[PDB]
Every structure is written in structure tokens, then in C-alpha cells.
Amino acid sequence: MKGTIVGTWIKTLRDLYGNDVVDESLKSVGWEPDRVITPLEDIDDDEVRRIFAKVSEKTGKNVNEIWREVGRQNIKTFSEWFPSYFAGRRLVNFLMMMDEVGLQLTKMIKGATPPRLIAKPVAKDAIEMEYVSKRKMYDYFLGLIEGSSKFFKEEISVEEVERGEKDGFSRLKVRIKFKNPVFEYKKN
Ligand code: HEM
Numbered sequence: 001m002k003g004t005i006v007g008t009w010i011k012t013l014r015d016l017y018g019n020d021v022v023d024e025s026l027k028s029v030g031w032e033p034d035r036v037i038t039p040l041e042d043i044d045d046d047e048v049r050r051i052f053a054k055v056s057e058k059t060g061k062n063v064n065e066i067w068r069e070v071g072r073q074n075i076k077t078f079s080e081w082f083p084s085y086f087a088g089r090r091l092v093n094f095l096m097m098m099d100e101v102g103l104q105l106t107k108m109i110k111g112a113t114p115p116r117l118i119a120k121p122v123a124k125d126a127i128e129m130e131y132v133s134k135r136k137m138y139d140y141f142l143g144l145i146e147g148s149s150k151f152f153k154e155e156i157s158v159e160e161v162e163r164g165e166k167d168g169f170s171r172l173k174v175r176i177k178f179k180n181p182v183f184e185y186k187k188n
Contacts, residue, residue, distance in 0.1 A: 002112050003041035006048060008081065010037075012074045017059055025054035042111055045135070064139045071143015075151050091152035092182050095119055095129065095145075115141075124181040128161065129174055136170035138163065145176070155179060 014022045023033035029050045037043070056063040079086045085101070088094055095117075102114040115133035122128050131141045142158070149156045162173040 001043050001045060001048065002039065002109065003037040003043060004039045006043045007037045007039075008074055008077045009048070009070060012070050012077045013055060015077070016069060016073055017055060021055055021058050024058060025051045028054045040110070067137060067139035068143045071140040071145075072147040072150065073143075074140075075144060075147030079151055086151060090182075091148060091154040091156070092127070092178060094148060094152065095127065095176070121183040122175065123177075124183050125179070126175055126177045129176060130162075131170075131172040133170050134168060136165070138170070138172050141172060142174075145174070 010022060010026070013025075026033050026035065029047050031047070031051075052063055052066060055061075056066055059066070061069075086094070096119050099117045099119060102117060105112045105114055113134075115131055115135070115137075117129060117131060119127050119129045129145075131138070142160075145156075145158055156179070157177045159175050159177075160172065161175055162171065164171055
């Protein structure tokens with residue numbers, strides 16, 4: 001990953017799991033517990049992987065479970081660093097815009113590699129959102145969704161539809177139902 005995102009993860013882990021757990025885990029991979037990560041740095045995905053593995057060991061929580069929790073809380077962290085994205089009224093609009101934001105950053109930020117988050121309405125009160133990535137952060141993705149619902153104070157039901165790997169790409173499709181109708185058939 002790029003530096004920006006790893007910065008948020010470290011912060012979120014600490015908020016979640018305390019300072020000693022994180023300090024220790026970063027040292028285990030040879031990092032400085034209080035490393036200053038710059039946005040445009042490139043960070044070894046395997047190093048991150050080993051960090052989270054250590055957090056798993058120290059806390060006794062399954063790594064997948066940690067990512068789920070990290071995903072939920074990281075929305076709070078990210079909204080504090082980058083408030084403008086969260087400035088809108090609605091959860092649905094937030095979610096529907098995310099794919100565009102991702103495409104744009106791939107273009108703007110050298111080396112940046114965010115997943116596709118393809119969203120499309122499937123009923124008056126529902127969209128499908130498909131995560132597509134070379135990485136595979138199924139639990140993180142799901143966590144982010146819940147965190148978003150939490151931030152926007154809009155209850156949603158999330159049901160997983162498809163999960164699988166093809167051609168080196170991990171995919172996860174969910175159906176997200178909103179409380180009220182948000183879509184309308186309008187003509188082509
Ligand atoms: C709120 C504004 C957001 C911005 C500006 C943003 C942008 C980014 C960036 C820059 C990365 C890292 C790319 C890299 O380091 O190579 C990333 C990773 C990721 N983003 Fe977002 N994101 C946002 C919200 C979300 C939301 C709401 C979701 C899910 C609904 C999401 C899904 C993911 C996932 C799952 C990753 C991990 C990388 C992977 O799985 O391949 N992001 N995002």
C-alpha cells in the first residue's frame with residue numbers, strides 16, 4: 001500500500017487494541033513503534049501482513065476478525081483525516097461515489113491501488129456493491145461498510161451474495177438494502 005492508508009491502520013489499531021500491542025507488533029517487523037509514515041511512501045504489503053498477524057497473536061483474535069474491527073473503526077479515523085468525503089447528507093450517495101473516487105486516485109497518485117467498488121441500484125431501496133481487488137481484504141471491506149452506516153447514522157441490511165477468486169483477483173458482491181426507497185425508474 002501507499003503510506004496514507006497504513007498511517008490510518010496504525011492509528012486505528014491503537015484505538016482498538018492499545019499502545020503496547022501496536023508498539024510490539026511494529027517492532028516485530030523491524031519498524032519503529034513511532035515511525036512517521038509519509039503519504040507517498042510505498043509500504044510492503046507483507047510487512048503489514050506480519051504486523052496484523054502479530055496483533056492477532058497478542059490479542060488472541062483471529063486476523064480476519066481484526067480486519068473486520070479495523071474496517072469498522074477506520075471509518076471514524078478516515079473521516080477525521082479526510083472530512084470532505086463525508087460531507088454529504090446521505091450514506092447512499094457516499095457509497096455510490098466511492099468507485100469514482102478510487103479510479104481518480106489511481107490516476108492521481110503514483111502507485112496507488114485502490115480496489116474497484118462497483119455499485120449499481122437493483123431495486124428502489126437497494127444496491128449491489130462489488131469489491132474487486134488483487135489483494136484480498138474481504139473482512140476489511142465488510143467492516144468499512146458497517147463503519148459507514150455507523151458514521152451516517154443510517155441502518156442498513158447487508159447480505160453477501162458472491163465471493164471468489166479469479167485470475168488473481170478477489171471479488172466480493174453484497175446487496176445493501178436501505179431503510180427507504182432512494183431510487184426511481186427514470187428513462188433511458
Ligand atoms: C472515504 C473516502 C475514501 C477514500 C478517499 C479511499 C481511498 C483509498 C485509498 C487511497 C486506498 C489505498 C490505495 C493504496 O494505498 O494503494 C484505499 C484502499 C481500500 N479501500 Fe478505500 N477510500 C475511501 C473509502 C472507502 C470505502 C467506504 C470503502 C468500502 C466501502 C473502501 C474500500 C477500500 C478497501 C477494501 C481498501 C483496501 C485495498 C484493497 O482491498 O485492495 N474505501 N482506499
